[PDB]
Amino acid sequence: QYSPNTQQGRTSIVHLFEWRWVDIALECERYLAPKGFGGVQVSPPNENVAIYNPFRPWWERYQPVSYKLCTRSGNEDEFRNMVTRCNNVGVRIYVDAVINHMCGNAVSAGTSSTCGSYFNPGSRDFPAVPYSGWDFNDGKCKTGSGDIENYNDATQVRDCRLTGLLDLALEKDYVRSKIAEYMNHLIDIGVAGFRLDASKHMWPGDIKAILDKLHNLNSNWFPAGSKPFIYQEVIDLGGEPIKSSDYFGNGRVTEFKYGAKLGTVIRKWNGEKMSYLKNWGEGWGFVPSDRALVFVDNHDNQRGHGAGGASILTFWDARLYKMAVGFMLAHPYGFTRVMSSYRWPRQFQNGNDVNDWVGPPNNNGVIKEVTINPDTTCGNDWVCEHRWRQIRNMVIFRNVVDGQPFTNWYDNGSNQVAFGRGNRGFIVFNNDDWSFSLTLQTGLPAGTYCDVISGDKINGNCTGIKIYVSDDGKAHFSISNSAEDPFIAIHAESKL
């Protein structure tokens, strides 16, 4: 459950947040495969409540109504089509599995659902699965309200309703079997793994009992005996009774300390400095590298209300954001996920964004297609961070240096730092308020290297900055603090 099951030499996944299946299928073929991306995390593919006030928020997709593969992203045919086309060019699909709960207990009964299925939350009837009142934790939860009230009590965090969402009785074999039937449907279609949403609110042993029921991966695309990649969403910043290590038996875990700390560092908040990153990783109290799924932001905390609050860097802070993603992709810690977002009309009142609910770009609720602009970014207000040259080229850097040790660290005791990955890559950051002009040991073989942040290697030409590594492995780097992107990265495949 710890292995991503990506193709040889692909080392990252991209969250195509709220994309339609047909657009993800195209993206696999036209971009993700040639540029070396490992896989795609997709939005939950099962039927969910259609919420009309507010109008179609992104988080309606975390309120299941059934396990039919029928959403605003597309139907089962389009989902199957996407998974087949991506697998056929060596790009995996990871599914956001919403299995802690069904929808909110106060949702009005009827057929306001993305496939028209009937459901009745008050009477706990989800006949499209089917679930009944016997399948929920109403009798198990011990709080007066029936909701989660105290996070110092690890039991109610698991058995009570998360903000009123109907909590499934995951100890029951029938419920485990309905969930496993859903995930096995997806596995046989060809998905490579799962993000387990809201894992903190599930018992580790109930998760294990569901995973015990899963098939091996589809043997047309994966070696025999391959197991689904499992990464569990657990927000563990310390100070709570539930620890993310309690979930290591089931798979990896999201390391939410990673982006919160990196954001504060690169923003230079709370006395932090980039030079402090010399011991980045478990030296900062993170989970072991082989159990971590890391990221700068995710779809949730990029809206500023989440784990890290305002320190999380997002596409809205593009200049610092590119630096943070670059550091993450160059550093060996963890398995890396890159965010790909859409724009919304952000409107902060008291440090919190009243429009943080707004869903994907839409015409009257129908999601807009991803259009590709001439400069290979995206239109229709899809941000497509994963197509930004500075980010895509660092996805490739991480492929090229895969396996090589963190080495040749430099820092100025402030915010100018550099390091190499074996003899395959070197990266240099200037986050101080003065220029960085210095000769550094790069570890790389002698020659001329294209800086892949400012440009690209095309044929035997560079379109941006060129770095000259001498026979001793040393190279001069000049980075103004005014530079558009104040970092430089070179690697074995950017050498002329």
């Binding site: 507010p54 988080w59 009123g164 949730d300 609910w357």
Partner: peptide, 9 residues
């Protein structure tokens, strides 16, 4: 809480 504090909406 969860989902960018969805319940406040």
């Amino acid at each position: 809480x969860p989902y960018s504090c969805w319940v406040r909406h």
